[PDB]
Amino acid sequence: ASKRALVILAKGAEEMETVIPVDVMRRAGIKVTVAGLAGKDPVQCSRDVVICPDASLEDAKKEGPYDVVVLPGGNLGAQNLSESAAVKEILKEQENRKGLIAAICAGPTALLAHEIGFGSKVTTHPLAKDKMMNGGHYTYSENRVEKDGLILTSRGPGTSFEFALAIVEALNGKEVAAQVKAPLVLKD
Ligand SMILES: *C(=N)N1CC[C@H](C(=O)Nc2nc3c(s2)CN(C(=O)CN[NH2+]N)CC3)C1
Numbered sequence: 001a002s003k004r005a006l007v008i009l010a011k012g013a014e015e016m017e018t019v020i021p022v023d024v025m026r027r028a029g030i031k032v033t034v035a036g037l038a039g040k041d042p043v044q045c046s047r048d049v050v051i052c053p054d055a056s057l058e059d060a061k062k063e064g065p066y067d068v069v070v071l072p073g074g075n076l077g078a079q080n081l082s083e084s085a086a087v088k089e090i091l092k093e094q095e096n097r098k099g100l101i102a103a104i105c106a107g108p109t110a111l112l113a114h115e116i117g118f119g120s121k122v123t124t125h126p127l128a129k130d131k132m133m134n135g136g137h138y139t140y141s142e143n144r145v146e147k148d149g150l151i152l153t154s155r156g157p158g159t160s161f162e163f164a165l166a167i168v169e170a171l172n173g174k175e176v177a178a179q180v181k182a183p184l185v186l187k188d
Contacts, residue, residue, distance in 0.1 A: 002031045003067040003171040006060055008087060009053050010037040012076025015045035016157040017104045021070055024164035027180045028172050030067075035060035037080060037087070046074040057086055067171050069094045073105030073125065073156075082113035091116045095150070100170055102152040104163050108132055117151040125156050161186055 005025050009018060018034075025032050036043055036053035043051050054060075069090060071081055081087050091114050094101050103111055105125045109132055111117050118137045123146040133140055144159045145152070145166045152170065154163035161184065169177040 002029055004065075005030050005032045005068045005070055005167070005171075006064065006066040006090070007032060007034050007070045007072070008037055008057060008081060008090070009034050009043050009051060009072070010074075010077045010080035010084075011043055011045075012074045012080060013043065013045050013051075013072045014074035014077060014105060014157065015047060015049040015051065017072040017074065017107070017160050018045065018051065020157075020160035021072070021102075021104075021164040021167065024161065024180060024184075025167060028168040028176050030168070030171060033060045033063065033066075037084060046077065057090075061086065061090060064090075064093075065097060065099065066094070068100040068102055068167055070167070071101070071103035071107035071110050073103075073107040073128075075106055078106035078109050078128075081107070081110035088114040098150060100150050100152060100167070102154075102163065102167050104154040104160060105156045106131075108153045111151070111153075112137060117148075120151040121146055121148040122151065122153045123155055124153065 034054045035057040039056045106128045122138045123141040124132045145154045
C-alpha cells in the first residue's frame, strides 16, 4: 500500500515550503492530501500564490490515519495552524499513534502551541527560535534538518528539499529517496 501524507494548508502558508514537500513526496509515490484548514476553497499563501486544496481538513481527517502530518511555515500560516483546535486534535492523535510529524521554518511553532513533542530536539528558522524556545519545552538545533524520533523539523525555504527528502527516506527508505533526488539537480 502506498504511504500517505497529510499537508495542512492555512492562509498565509509559505508556498515554497508547501509545494516543495508535496511535489517531492508525490515523486516518491506517497499519496499526498493537501488539506485546506478553512475548507476546500483556494488558499492565499504568504506571497499571494493561490493553491487549491485537494480536500478540506474536515474531510481529510476522516480519511486517516496518515504516515506523516506536514506543517509548512509562513508567519500567518503557522499562526493559523497554532490557533486551530482541529490541528491540535490531529497532531495529538499522530503523536499518540507513533506517527511522524514534520514541520518547517515557522511551522514548528505550531508544535509548541499544541504541546507536541516536548523534550524533543528541534530546529526552526532563526527568526522563529525565540518563539519556539519560550518556556524551554524543547532543545534547539542548528542542523538544517533535525529528526528526533517521530519529530522532524527544518529551517527554511532553502532547506525544503532536504526536509522533503528526509520525509521520503523515513517513509519509503533510502533507495526511494536517492531515486527521487537523482533528477532534481540539487547541489551536492
Ligand atoms: C518560515 N516559514 N518563516 C521564517 C520567517 C517567517 C517567520 O517565522 N516570521 C516570524 N515573525 C514572528 C515570529 S516568526 C515570532 N514572533 C515572536 O517572537 C513574538 N513573540 N513571541 N513569543 C512574532 C513575529 C516565516
